[PDB]
Symmetry: C6
Amino acid sequence: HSTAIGRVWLSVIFIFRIMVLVVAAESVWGDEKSSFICNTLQPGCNSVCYDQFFPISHVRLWSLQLILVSTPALLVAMHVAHQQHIEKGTLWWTYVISVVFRLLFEAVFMYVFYLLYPGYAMVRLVKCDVYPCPNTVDCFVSRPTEKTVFTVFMLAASGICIILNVAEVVYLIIRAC
Amino acid sequence: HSTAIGRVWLSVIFIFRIMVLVVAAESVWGDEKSSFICNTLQPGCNSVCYDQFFPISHVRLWSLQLILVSTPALLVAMHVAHQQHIEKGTLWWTYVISVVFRLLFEAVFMYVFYLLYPGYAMVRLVKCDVYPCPNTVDCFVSRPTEKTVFTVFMLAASGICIILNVAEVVYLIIRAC
Amino acid sequence: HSTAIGRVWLSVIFIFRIMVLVVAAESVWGDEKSSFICNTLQPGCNSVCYDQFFPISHVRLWSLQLILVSTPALLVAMHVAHQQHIEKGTLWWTYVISVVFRLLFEAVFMYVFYLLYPGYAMVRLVKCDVYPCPNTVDCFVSRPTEKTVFTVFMLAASGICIILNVAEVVYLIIRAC
Amino acid sequence: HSTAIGRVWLSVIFIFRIMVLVVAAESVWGDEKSSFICNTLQPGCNSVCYDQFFPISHVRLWSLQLILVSTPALLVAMHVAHQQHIEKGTLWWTYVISVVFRLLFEAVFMYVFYLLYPGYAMVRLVKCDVYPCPNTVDCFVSRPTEKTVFTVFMLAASGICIILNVAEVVYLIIRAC
Amino acid sequence: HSTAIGRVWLSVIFIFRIMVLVVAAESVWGDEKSSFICNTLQPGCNSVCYDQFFPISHVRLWSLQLILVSTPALLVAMHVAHQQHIEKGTLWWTYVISVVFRLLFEAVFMYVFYLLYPGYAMVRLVKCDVYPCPNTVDCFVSRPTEKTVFTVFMLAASGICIILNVAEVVYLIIRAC
Amino acid sequence: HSTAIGRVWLSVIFIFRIMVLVVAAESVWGDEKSSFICNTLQPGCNSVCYDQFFPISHVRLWSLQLILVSTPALLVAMHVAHQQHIEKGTLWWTYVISVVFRLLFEAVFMYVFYLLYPGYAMVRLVKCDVYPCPNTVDCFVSRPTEKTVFTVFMLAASGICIILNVAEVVYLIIRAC
């Protein structure tokens, strides 16, 4: 029990997302903290300002999102293996449940991205006033344009995944009827 | 002799923990000491303060926990292989013993985490007075928020593992009766 | 349904491009930002000037181009696998569509390269006036000659791929007639 | 000819030691020299003091110990393969000899550890008076507590291996009688 | 259709070249730019002087040479696979053509090496007068002796390959007659 | 045609040498140049003095030695494969020739080691007077004791290999008679 469009398209988009994350994590986000600098003589201002403006990096968010999204399919695969071992529309039901959970995980991670980083674009200069920085200090972000490009790519792929998951759920409902 | 729920769920949670540890160790905790800095001119204060506040890193604790938790299953696998070679509810007993040992290892590591790092949250600023630091010095922690997020994820997964191991033991007892 | 020349030549050129990208990314472009320096005492000038002159690195552009170009063939492979599973000139049509999409992706990425980096050659010295750099500052690029050589290689291979894709489409049309 | 307990237990402890060494070498001991610093302006004092207090690192000692301990089993495996090829209690004798050699290697490496590093604990501060350091200088060790923890783990595993090897030899003697 | 001497000897020399390149690229040439320093206070002099004296590194030249030399055999392998699929002295001709192309690639890369780096030896001190360096400055090369040794090894292997390719072509001609 | 002792012992010693080289190259010799420092303000003195005292590193010498020693066996393997393909005491002769070549390579590399580094021990302090260093300067070597230990291990293994190769040649001669 599996839709024809979904197995072809969802897997391809997932592989595309994984490949983009691999080519982006190593190089684009590698020096995100080491090259983050602020115009100040205050010790510790660089670290606290980086922590303030980047609570969790985009790459780690995408990695966690991919792991969480792949988890329900992993559970389904283990269940199928154990069923096959025991053999030596309940499956339809658990499959639709897994698809719904994948959709929910994708949507929640998109909302978390909206909360933490309102706006897809990354700015060159940020103003930080966290203790122990005196008054407000200027800090400069590493590769904001390249990071913006990769953010657009990953968000577009995630949105395509969301729409495709809704379409797959609708197809499953139609198959039931 | 193996429960249906356990083989599906415990393995999935274990794989999730391993994946999270892999995506976290390389990047989040990589610069935990190199970017640890203190507001002082005293030579050696950075190293002693880091050693004081981080006796063993979270990542190394999680790695050791995973190795120790996987050890009893490794022993069971070797015993099964050697039994199969010789063939060319004792097994039930050694399986329940291995499950109990896994539960014990998980609980002890959770207690060790409570002892070393009371509180899941990581702070930006720590006060260190270890020799040779004069009086009390301020020191700043690298990526406290991201580390807190990953700590919450790993602790939640470990607690789920503990509850699931208790459930599996109870199921084994019911199977015995 | 596949042309004799294409399967031999396109795959070889693709593998050549991948190998060149692998040998170039690690070493040639690795220190592109860390060794980028400007003649100024202004904090943050190095980072903003690098971001201005290199919105996205050549290596990341080539990696994205390769992923996007390989995507339609990936979709075709998944569709063929699912068709084979179900079995347990529509294919011609989807193959020609995939070839056209590959050609389009290659052409668009060449145009993007023209837009971002007019001229294949990389210069030693660039003049940057982005805020907060005062007036105009001199900045120096890492390994411009080697990067120019690899740019010529990759652009030549991409152009060969474009011509070969057009030839393959023409052969498919002739086969139809 | 192989004991039932040994093949299960020795291999598991060996794998545990290898895993601990892998998780420890990369991160715990990686900055052992680069972060070793002394309170002095004397050029070359850091390097000579590090060489004095750490003639060979713990990780390299453990790696050499594992290689040497695995060597007799490697020779036995090659001999078994060559015997099987030729076929296309001499074996008992060479097996007991290999077990004795493994025990000897483990014991000698434990004695070497006692000689080089008397005491399992690693100290934060060391006093170094090697030329060209003037008088006595203070030097600070990287991650002494974590290194102490991993040292305890590895020494305990090695001692368990020693006891288990003696037990296996005794079982072989009993089998002979 | 393949000569007896060539398949044994050319492949062995190719594997030797690959192994030498692998053991040399990581360590010998890794710090070729980072440890390149000039006796000046002029910003940007180090980078421009390195670019002037090393337009493309020896390691990248050897990597490109190996890829280009292996390309004709890759095309022949793809053609053989496609011929075998279709089956489910034209081959002699394409094989001799591929051998000639391999010889040509090797010779052209040797000539390029002669052009860029006249003389196998690498010097310790170079004199650089590229803008913006004032007058002439002294610059110092990293590991010139080790690089010279590896250059001699790689050039000798390439020359052996050239002679062997000529011998293989002559053998093919004799086989034709 | 192969001796019983040789296939067991030579391969084991070769694997031991490879393992020791792997565990030594990454960590022991990794900072051999970056941590090499001299007591001087003269620019370029560090690099020229390192080049003078370490023309080729021990690790690179051992890697080259292993590649060269494994080459004759590689040629023999290719010849055996091609003979087997054609089939679809000449072999004794080429085998003894390969063994003699292995012995010669090992002996020549030992002599080269004697020439470049007379004495197994590595010293902490070296005196360098190469231009442009003024007069004689003191320079300090990284991890001399650990490097000495690994040098002793590798030289002992190479000497064992030499003796074993002579024994294998003598056995082959006795087999001939």
